[PDB]
């Protein structure tokens, strides 16, 4: 729930940050956002130009809606586009227009059964058709300002759609203000906990949402905002940090290296573990992790055994190998992993004291409590100042269990088992020559 | 310093562009950017709406600051966030507010010792609390315009923060104008050369900077702008361009290929060489290269030997191999590498003359002086029109030194040594059968 803990494993040159809580996007909720349109001195010329801006944007969006919707072809906006193709049917936009008369928001059930939360964020019909057309003529300038303020959002929404080919992510305050999004969260069919979670992190909700331009028909401008559904909440999460583990023979080039490849975020999900290899897809609010299951791999509960016994036969833990013993560092949640090899100078420093630690050759770990920076040669690393408990788990480096002569130097996506039987066959290669003579 | 030179190596189907100068981001400098806030007819309704926009943005930012700061978890904004957590302490914002009374900028030493350059880019307190509140009432419209102009920056800064989850890069003119950034550069503790370098390339400084939303407390809106520190200046840089090198046996499929994998930018850094495999991370101002050391690999000075003797035993030069002899081209700083294999048509053309060169099978190189485009089958390549000297270094293609029968076809991240001993074992595999009979 809080109380971030972190364990570094001397044996595998890796660390695990535990104590986080999950918020996993497992589904999508489509909502329909609508703008109603009016079909139609220096005071008047300002109105002339501003009305030209209004209608130019409408025709611009009308050109954009011509059988457009698609992005990335990851089929992420597939759920939203499905609603869009339905909105293109005879009286479906009219249902939305009917419910939103003299209101800002409404629930509509399309003839497919899909209930959509609908919102009217701007009324240019009831402005142009009731205050602006009623007057080439004369006017007072503070109507020019008022028309510019209202028309601005339509122009800015057309701005985003044109440059993003009708689909935008993340969702801007132009597409949906905090007020409008918080209202939408309040009424979409989710747990009181899910509503609380989304409302406290609307910025993250924007990151994992889409705005899809749909249709301009019957004087309604409608676009679909595809909101995330977090169906997995409050389950344990943990992040795995990995760094190369090499031998430290004195002579340069005579060393063999090994690195765990399964780094990223892991979260419990219904008896299995969801793994997100691309830390891009996860957002962290200092004890809560929001991740998209689209880029997730569903793994057994036994994958955690790679943190306690990397040689267990129940799971085939993945590593890569090399014989390049370069010096590098990784910044974890509560500290830093420092892989110092060869002649390189590696240090940890406090901004007020200077160097308070010099690392020896090998893989080591320091916490962030009294350290500000870490230097590995020509690179300067800054540590996070998150608060937690840091643990060091003693153990023999597993790179010492391998014979350098039979060790597979180049393996990019191997594993403990695959490396072993690769070694077995190379041991058999020498062996059948060991009894001929 | 200038005078870009470029050498193409016939032996390894690669080229090196020398003569560039370095500007390497090795550290960060955190500065604090502040906005002071006021705590609180058709003329008045415009003020009403514009004041609603003002306070809605404040509450929007207040919702965003709730234990937020993090992005990417590369720990890039770690230094800036460390200042942010300090600004959350009892009288630390008050120190910033005290120094910035009746001024635009000031140096503040926080109680941690960290001296921060502080700037006040907008004063909405001394506007709302002195000209706007002094008047529901009456007014003259040119106060409506004036309030809209001042409030715009606050609204636009809230615009960026909401869609980027409180951390934005690159840094916009909304976060920090050229005037404000140039002033900040002038006073941050760097060499006169570093100040000159940053001030002539503020656009690049923006590319390698972060703006972090921090806190709204005690009527101050503060965000941290994390400016780059270029601790390595004016050292030689060079870019390596690589293209496949294949044999040219007549029969399709009977050929073996080879490609150097170490392409990217290289720069001298304190007795070693900094390598940036992701040319994304480097920005080039036609003889000056700005690179971030976060994505850098620190390599020995001997790595350059791969450009003069790819078979040297001092460095294990990296290659990948294949038996697919497809035709492809690479556009270098001063020309183009053309790998033409099989039946494909490869040409270089001048926009006024047409085809002035037809390439034969193999790897070749042409300069950009009198060539405008290069065609390799169905692809059209345009060459840069940078000026320099282009050199062709004769040499036997190293792919001809390999026997196709023992040649490892699929190696993705191999090296000269790893390929050799892979060949040795496969030669031993045939050999022990060569003396049984």
């Amino acid at each position, epitope marked *: 729930g809080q109380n971030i803990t972190e364990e570094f494993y001397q044996s595998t040159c890796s660390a695990v940050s535990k104590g986080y809580l999950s918020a996993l996007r497992t589904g999508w909720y489509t909502s329909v956002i609508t703008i109603e349109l009016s079909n139609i001195d220096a005071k008047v010329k300002l109105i002339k130009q501003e009305l030209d801006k209004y209608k130019n944007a409408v025709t611009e969006l009308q050109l954009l809606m011509q059988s457009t919707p698609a992005t990335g072809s990851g089929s992420a906006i597939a759920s939203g586009v499905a609603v869009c193709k339905v909105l293109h049917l005879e009286g479906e936009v009219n249902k939305i227009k009917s419910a939103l008369l003299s209101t800002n928001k409404a629930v509509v059930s399309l003839s497919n059964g899909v209930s959509v939360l609908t919102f009217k964020v701007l009324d240019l019909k009831n402005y142009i058709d009731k205050q602006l057309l009623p007057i080439c003529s004369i006017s007072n300038i503070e109507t020019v300002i008022e028309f510019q303020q209202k028309n601005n959002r339509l122009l800015e929404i057309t701005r985003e759609f044109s440059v993003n080919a009708g689909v935008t992510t993340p969702v801007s305050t132009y597409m949906l203000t905090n007020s409008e999004l918080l209202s939408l969260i309040n009424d979409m069919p989710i747990t009181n906990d899910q509503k609380k979670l989304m409302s406290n992190n609307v910025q993250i909700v924007r990151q994992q949402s889409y705005s899809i331009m749909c249709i301009i028909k019957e004087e309604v401008l409608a676009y679909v905002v595809q909101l995330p559904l977090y169906g997995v909440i409050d389950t344990p999460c943990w992040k795995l940090h990995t760094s190369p583990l090499c031998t430290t023979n004195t002579k340069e080039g005579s060393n063999i290296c090994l690195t765990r490849t399964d780094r990223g975020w892991y979260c419990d999900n219904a008896g299995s573990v969801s793994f997100f290899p691309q830390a891009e897809t996860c957002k962290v609010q200092s004890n809560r992790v929001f991740c998209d299951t689209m880029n997730s791999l569903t793994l057994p509960s036994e994958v955690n055994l790679c943190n306690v016994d990397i040689f267990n036969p129940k799971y085939d833990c993945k590593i890569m190998t090399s014989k390049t013993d370069v010096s590098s560092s990784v910044i974890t949640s509560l500290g830093a992993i420092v892989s110092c090899y060869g002649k390189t100078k590696c240090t940890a420093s406090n901004k007020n004291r200077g160097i308070i*630690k010099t690392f020896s050759n090998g893989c080591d770990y320091v916490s962030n*409590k009294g*350290v500000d920076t870490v230097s590995v040669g020509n690179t300067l690393y800054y540590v996070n100042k998150q608060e937690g408990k840091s643990l060091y788990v003693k153990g023999e480096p597993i790179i010492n269990f391998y014979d350098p002569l039979v060790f597979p130097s180049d393996e990019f996506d191997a594993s403990i088992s695959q490396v072993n039987e690769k070694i077995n066959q190379s041991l058999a290669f020498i062996r059948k020559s060991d009894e001929l003579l | 310093g200038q005078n870009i030179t470029e050498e193409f190596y016939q032996s390894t189907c690669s080229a090196v562009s020398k003569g560039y100068l370095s500007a390497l981001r090795t550290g960060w400098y955190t500065s604090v950017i502040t906005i002071e806030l006021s705590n609180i007819d058709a003329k008045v309704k415009l003020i009403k709406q514009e004041l609603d926009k003002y306070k809605n943005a404040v509450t929007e930012l207040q919702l965003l600051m709730q234990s937020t700061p993090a992005t990417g978890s590369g720990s890039a904004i770690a230094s800036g966030v460390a200042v942010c957590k300090v600004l959350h302490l009892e009288g630390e914002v008050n120190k910033i507010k005290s120094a910035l009374l009746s001024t635009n900028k000031a140096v503040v030493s926080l109680s941690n010792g960290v001296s921060v350059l502080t700037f006040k880019v907008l004063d909405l307190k001394n506007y709302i609390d002195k000209q706007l509140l002094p008047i529901c009432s009456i007014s003259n419209i040119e106060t409506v315009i004036e309030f809209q102009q001042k409030n715009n920056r606050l609204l636009e800064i809230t615009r960026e923060f909401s869609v980027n989850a409180g951390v934005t890069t690159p840094v916009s003119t909304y976060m920090l104008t050229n005037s404000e950034l140039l002033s900040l550069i002038n006073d941050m503790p760097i060499t006169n050369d570093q100040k000159k370098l940053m001030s002539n390339n503020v656009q690049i400084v923006r590319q390698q900077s972060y703006s972090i939303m921090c806190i709204i407390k005690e009527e101050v809106l503060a965000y941290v702008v994390q400016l780059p520190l270029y601790g390595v200046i004016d050292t030689p840089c060079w870019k390596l361009h690589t293209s496949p090198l294949c044999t040219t046996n007549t029969k399709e499929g009977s050929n073996i290929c080879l490609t150097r994998t170490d392409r990217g930018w290289y720069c001298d850094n304190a007795g070693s060489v900094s390598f940036f495999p992701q040319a994304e991370t480097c920005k080039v101002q036609s003889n000056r290269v700005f690179c971030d050391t976060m994505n850098s690999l620190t390599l020995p000075s001997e790595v350059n030997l791969c450009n003069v003797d790819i078979f040297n035993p001092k460095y294990d030069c990296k290659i990948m191999t294949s038996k697919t002899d497809v035709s492809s081209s690479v556009i270098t700083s001063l020309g183009a590498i053309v790998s033409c294999y099989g039946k494909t048509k490869c040409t270089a053309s001048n926009k006024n003359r047409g085809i002035i060169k037809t390439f034969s099978n193999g790897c070749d190189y042409v300069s950009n002086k009198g060539v405008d485009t290069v065609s390799v089958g169905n692809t059209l390549y345009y060459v840069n029109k940078q000026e320099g000297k282009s050199l062709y270094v004769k040499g036997e293609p190293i792919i001809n030194f390999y026997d196709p029968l023992v040649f490892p076809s699929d190696e993705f991240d191999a090296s000269i040594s790893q390929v050799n001993e892979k060949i040795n074992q496969s030669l031993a595999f045939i050999r022990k059968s060569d003396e049984l009979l």
Partner: antibody
Amino acid sequence: QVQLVQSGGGVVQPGRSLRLSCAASGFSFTNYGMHWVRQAPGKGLEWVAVISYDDGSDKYYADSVKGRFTISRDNSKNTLYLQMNSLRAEDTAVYYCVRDPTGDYGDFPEQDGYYYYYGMDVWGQGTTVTVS
Amino acid sequence: QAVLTQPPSASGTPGQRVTISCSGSSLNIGSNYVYWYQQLPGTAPKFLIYKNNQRPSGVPDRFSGSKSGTSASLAISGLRSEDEADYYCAAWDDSLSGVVFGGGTKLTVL
């Protein structure tokens, strides 16, 4: 039964040397840093030295004793030492042995990779040293 | 000369709150955590406050701590007779490389 028991008290000659001992019982001594703290007659507390956890890599002294005093630990004997050299009249004080929590605030100790000051939770009852 | 400055004496009647101040520099208190100790007469110091505001197990609620910029203070609410003791603040100092103590505060209970 967390317990620190000190021994080694007595009078000495200026310019001579003298050692102190505090034997830990009731907890895993290896996993915690340890402090030496004195209190001169009628004066306040003065921090003397600290030893890092398990291996003592990091070991810091005050300038009042720098270059003359030395700290060391025997994890097998669960016992802490203070090497006092070149004793002077100003060193005359009651000497205390203290465990540094090293993370254990009621849960478990941590391993930061360097010395960090978590406080001073378990104290010996003190021993008396007089230089005359 | 007691790198951390705190008042020499304090006095109080039962039920009162006494407040003991402790002022340092950017290099000791402004940068690091502050810890408080209580030393009854003839006894060893007792661990009282850690990380500027945390009670160790078995320390009553009426003791509270706080830190402000470069200075810290300890609030002994509901003053009781046995609270009569010397109170010391302490923190890690980065200008040196060791722990620094306050001057002590002889607190008398009436």
